[PDB]
Amino acid sequence: AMARKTKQQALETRQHILDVALRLFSQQGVSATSLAEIANAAGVTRGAIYWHFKNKSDLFSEIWELSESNIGELEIEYQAKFPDDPLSVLREILVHILEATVTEERRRLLMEIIFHKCEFVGEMVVVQQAQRSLCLESYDRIEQTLKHCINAKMLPENLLTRRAAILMRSFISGLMENWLFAPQSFDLKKEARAYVTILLEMYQLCPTLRA
Amino acid sequence: ARKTKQQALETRQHILDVALRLFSQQGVSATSLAEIANAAGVTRGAIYWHFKNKSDLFSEIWELSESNIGELEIEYQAKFPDDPLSVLREILVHILEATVTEERRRLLMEIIFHKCEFVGEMVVVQQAQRSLCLESYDRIEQTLKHCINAKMLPENLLTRRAAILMRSFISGLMENWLFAPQSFDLKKEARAYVTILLEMYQLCPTLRAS
């Protein structure tokens, strides 16, 4: 009784539920997938999954937010790696995001679901509203990064940083979305470094990016 | 007769416009053809005459919008017959601005990005659209090469890499704006963004062959 409860409630069980959910959501869509289905696929009881999670929206939010937190961790890492070169920090973070969309199961499936396997309606509206706020936060953080680069003299002093930040997110999200939609249409893993290099060349060179 | 009107183009189009409004609010998965009939003021018999299923209905509106873009390309080519780079610029600016300003485009894109799971019957729509996307990349490459021919873009521009980037740049702006429409003014900034895209073709060394 209590031994079995402890195992049901464990972090490793939780992780497995989340990974199995990603797989089921990517195959059949969020709308058609129930918590009970996820539990059966994860080899846990219905009681266990409903202890772990209030609903499938909250489950999905958790994955999405853990991914966002992994990105933050890598930034802290790359900063300590290239403390004299913020533009390389930014380059490597962006190339890692793009390549991981192809190569890492968790990121690939999460992004596939965000873009192609989840309607932002019903209980998912609360997930969209939260991620909307995180988008805005992201733009401010991206502006900050660009300003770090300007202060290091590595980007134009008159860069339009908000325009630049909007373009960062759209350029990178578009590449991810288009590739996931049609993964044989181009080789995102191979071309990722070129594409990020082109983005950073844009900031350095395109006159409509300057005041 | 009742029948003439049920089968009439105008009724079909009211059904399609009402489906867009419903799908955009409720999602494709929750929305039945019966619901769309009721909202359009037609019988269930009438809507199932026009459409066998939601995907066929959605596919039709998707393609009607794609057709209107094709039409704009033809019109811009006649406005700028000696200037393919301006044709391109104006088509792209139009697409971006119309995402904000035109109801049909705004709702269609919102559904494509945020309100339709590509599963079940929707996989055949994804397959059709994947083929259209492959065609689009080749048309974009051709347009770029014609610009190169006119000496308006660099002789060594990497056209395929450039094409991939065009679609991603433009789709990413649309998607990001529709996700968070108060986060930036896409209508206002569209012309700057397209100009920046074309400046990238002209200037960025990694867009050119070594």
- Please report, for chain A, the start and end positions of each structural domain, with discontinuous segments joined by +: 1-211
Nearest to B178 by CA among A112, A58, A97, A135: A135
Burial class (CB in 10 A: 0-12, 13-18, 19+), B9: exposed
Q: What angle do CA A20, A25, A27 make, to 5 degrees?
A: 100
Please spell the DSSP secondary structure of B21-87, one letter per residue. Answer: HHHHHH-TTT--HHHHHHHHT--HHHHHHH-SSHHHHHHHHHHHHHHHHHHHHHHHHHHSTT-HHHH
Interface mutation vs chain B, best among A57, A166, A197, A209, most B CBs within 10 Å: A166
Task: With H, G, I as helix, E, B as strand and everything else as coil, classify residue A159.
Answer: strand
Closest CB from B30, B171, B176 relative to A121: B30
Cα B64 from Cα B59, distance rounded (Å): 9
For A185, the enclosing helix (H) or strand (E) is none
Nearest to A146 by CA among A175, A168, A131: A168
Domain covering B1-210 in this structure, CATH number: 1.10.357.10
Compute how many other C-beta atoms are within 10 angstroms of the C-beta atom of residue B52: 11
Name the method of structure determination: X-ray
Which residues, other chains included, contact B93 with Cβ-Cβ below 8 Å and sequence gap of 6+? B190, B191, B194
Q: Between chains, do B199 and A202 touch, taking CB under 8 Å as contact?
A: yes
Q: Are A149 and A81 in contact (CB under 8 A)?
A: no
**What whole-number distance in Å separates Cα of residue A97 and Cα of residue B78?**
42
* Cα–Cα distance for residue pair A63/A52, rounded to 1 Å: 13
- Angle, in degrees to the nearest 10, between helices A86-103 and A56-81: 140
- Within 10 angstroms of residue A194's Cβ, the number of other Cβ atoms is 15
Task: Tell me the residue type at B1.
Answer: A
Strand partners, A159: A210
How far is A70 from A64, CA to CA, in rounded Å?
10
DSSP H helical ranges for A10-160: 11-28, 35-42, 46-52, 56-81, 86-103, 105-112, 124-151
The CATH number assigned to the domain with range A1-211 reads 1.10.357.10
Closest to B60 (Cα-Cα) out of B120, B111, B26, B114:
B111
**Closest approach of A18 to chain B, Cα-based (Å):** 20
Q: Which residues of A touch B89 (CB under 8 A)?
A: none
CA distance B3 to chain A (A): 35
Residue A70 in tokens: 């992994």
Q: Please answer whether residues A81 and A148 qualify as being in contact, where contact means their C-beta atoms are separated by less than 8 angstroms.
A: no
Backbone angles phi and psi of B157, in degrees to 5: -55, 135
Q: Please tell me what resolution, in angstroms, this structure has.
A: 1.6
Question: Residue A208 and residue B200: Cβ atoms within 8 Å?
Answer: no
- Which amino acid is located at A152 in the chain? A
Rg (CA), chain A: 20
